[PDB]
Every structure is written in structure tokens, then in C-alpha cells.
Design a protein around this ligand. Sequence first.
Ligand SMILES: N[C@H](CCC(=O)N[C@@H](CS)C(=O)NCC(=O)O)C(=O)O
Ligand SMILES: N[C@H](CCC(=O)N[C@@H](CS)C(=O)NCC(=O)O)C(=O)O
Lengths: 208, 208
Amino acid sequence: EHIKVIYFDGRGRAESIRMTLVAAGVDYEDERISFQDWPKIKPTIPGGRLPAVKVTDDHGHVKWMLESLAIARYMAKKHHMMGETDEEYYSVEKLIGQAEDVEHEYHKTLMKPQEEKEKITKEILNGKVPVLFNMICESLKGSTGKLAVGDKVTLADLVLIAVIDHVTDLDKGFLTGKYPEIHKHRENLLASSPRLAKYLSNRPATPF
Amino acid sequence: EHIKVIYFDGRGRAESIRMTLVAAGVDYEDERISFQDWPKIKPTIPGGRLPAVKVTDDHGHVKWMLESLAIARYMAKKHHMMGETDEEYYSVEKLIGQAEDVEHEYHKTLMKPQEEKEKITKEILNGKVPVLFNMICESLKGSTGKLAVGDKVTLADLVLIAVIDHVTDLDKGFLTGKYPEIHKHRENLLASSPRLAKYLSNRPATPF
Ligand SMILES: N[C@H](CCC(=O)N[C@@H](CS)C(=O)NCC(=O)O)C(=O)O
Ligand SMILES: N[C@H](CCC(=O)N[C@@H](CS)C(=O)NCC(=O)O)C(=O)O
């Protein structure tokens, strides 16, 4: 396959797909569309929303895939990153759901005036986000190994770090001197996946 | 197992779990907590949020499961309702993600004054919801069989009908004389699963 991941110039909903490919050691083309260009390109993407993944073989030819975490789960399943037992699969999905709930809170701050955004940010960071972080902590403590689920990288690990990055977008100091399990998880992940370590260190800085 | 599904007296986030058990032919206890009682019960549920599923064997004894769609996916996997091939698994997850996006829009109307709720409802039903329904329609048309993914019931079918029910909560007339693929899907599902047909006909009416 030639794999092309098409998204805006940000982490956003595409980051789980990028990280999955990176962790699995799969080469892909990272196609990033400027907001100025999007209205021109939107008519050409099946469904008209991003991310979309265009997969080209050489036999038939083009296949389009939509729906970010459907794509990520499929790729993760192909590469043995959705758990090794049914119980691990549940644990992966549980942490994904918890992480997605944090993402839902973060999403409230997007496209808001630089005044209301500050109000929403304070509300979610002093309200639901700490509650979800406590659940995430409990989920991590429940692991049988050094990563989110056992000792092998799963999609849960990647979803988790992507959402934590959105939290630190809102408040760079949110985890400073706090949440040792979250820090340890990231350290353990980076030690476990040099491909991901390299990718994260070379990743362009984006606002979302 | 004795399985107890614990939720508020509504469909909400528990409905995917209930429907999965029903479709799979698994008996469970449906424990519904009144809002008046919740502050009293909240301290006793691991994580303090619903739904939670309490599973009792007779050997060890109690296991708690959290995170609605993690629970639903695990139960669906155990009962061969997550697709028969990797490509079907992707299709299941794709329709789940699309359906969940409709649910996200619906969620905006909850706990709002009976004036702003009417304003949000109009906005989402004339905006993003029709766009998502078109995607859902395309996903259904893509099926190799009579249901959402092939000819066998999957978790995608159940998530889909649960979210459509939330749409018709907002506007009872939203699908009247429209969206023939959505109607056909429901008819096909009910013909395919007499257990679900019976369950839906006997289900108590709830506001969410
Ligand atoms: N369920 C989603 C939603 C994708 C989505 O909401 N895409 C947005 C950007 S993250 C978009 O393409 N909006 C621009 C537009 O619709 O014109 C997914 O995760 O793939
Ligand atoms: N990711 C969720 C969230 C569960 C959730 O938001 N629960 C709400 C009701 S749907 C709740 O228990 N709120 C009452 C409270 O937190 O005190 C799941 O699907 O299980």
C-alpha cells in the first residue's frame, strides 16, 4: 500500500492514526491541508470531512477510509496493538473511552473568543478534567505491565498521549509536579517505542 | 455470570449495553437508579459514574466493568457481533463513530433551559445532523448485506438505532417520509432479531 493521511495542519483527530502507523513502523505520506485551501479541496474528499486516508495499491488501485478512530483501530488490530486477549481488548477500549471524554472537554474551547475560551478552560480544568484524570490514573494502575495495557504498545497508549497533549495546550502547567502515573506512562512508552520517541521529537509544533 | 447493568432510568449511554445483551440472548438485571437516589449511591460505584456493570460469578465473585462502549464492544466481541473479517470490523467501527458524532450533537440539548434547548435543537437538526445522516446513509448503502455490516447483527446496528431514537426525541417528525435507508435498516434489523423486536416493544418510555 501507499498510505496517505489527509488532515489539517494539526494533531487533532489525525494524530491517533499517525501515531499508530509510526508505532507499527508503517511508512505513510502526511498530507496537511491549509485552512485557506480547504473549501477548494472539500468537494474532492469522500464525505467532505477530515481525516481521510487514501490507500493506493497497484492492482485495483484506490481505497478511501474515513472516521479517525475506526481507521486507527483497524490499523492497530492489523499490527497487534488492540490487546492479546479479550480482557486486554476491553482495557484498551476502556482507556480509549476515558481519554475521549477528556478530548470532549477540550473540544469545548475550540473556535471560541479569547475571553470565553479562558472561561471554558478554567471550568473544565477545575471540574471534569481532574475527575477524568483520576479515572485514567486508576486505569493505568490497573495495568499488568509498564504501559496502559500490559507491556506492549497498544492504541490506548497513543490515544492517551494525544489527549494529554491537548490538555497541556490549554495549560502548560497542568501536570507540573503532579500526576506521577501519567508522567511515568509517557516515559515508559518512549522507552518502549524508539520510533514514537523519534517521531514526537521531530513533530512540527501545531496549535491543535 | 450474573450480570447487573446499573444506570439511570433512561436509555442514554447504557442502551448499547442492554441491546447487545438482548441481541446476544444474555440474561441480565437492569438496575435503574432514580436521580433523587444517585447522590446516595454515587460513593458505592467504582469511578462514581454510570453506566457500570457488576458481574458476579460464584467462584471468585465480583468484577466491575466501566465505560459504556468499552463494555458493549467486549460483549459484542464475545458474541461475534464485531464483524467476521478485519474489513467488517473497520465498517462496524466506522458506523459507530458516525453514530457517536450524531450523539455528540444531541448531547448539546441536555440540561438546557426550555428556550435555549429549542434554539440548539433547531441549529443541530438543520446543520450537522443532516450532514451526518447523509454519511450514515452512505455507510448503510455500502453494506454487503441487509444490515449495517453484512447480514448479521453487529454492534453498529444497535448503536445506530439508539442514536436515531435520540434524534426522534428531539423531533418526532425528523424522519417522516424521509431517509428510506434508515427506515429499511430498522425494519431489516427487527426482522433479523426477534429478541430485539420484543425488547424494543416492551421497553419503558424514558425521556433520554
Ligand atoms: N468522527 C470524526 C469527525 C471528523 C471531523 O469532525 N472533521 C472535522 C475536522 S476534525 C472537519 O473535517 N471539519 C471541516 C468541514 O467539515 O468542512 C473523525 O474522528 O474522523
Ligand atoms: N464515557 C462515558 C461517560 C459516562 C457518563 O458521562 N456518565 C454520566 C451519565 S451518562 C454520569 O454517571 N454522571 C453523573 C455523575 O457523574 O455524578 C460512558 O460512556 O460510560
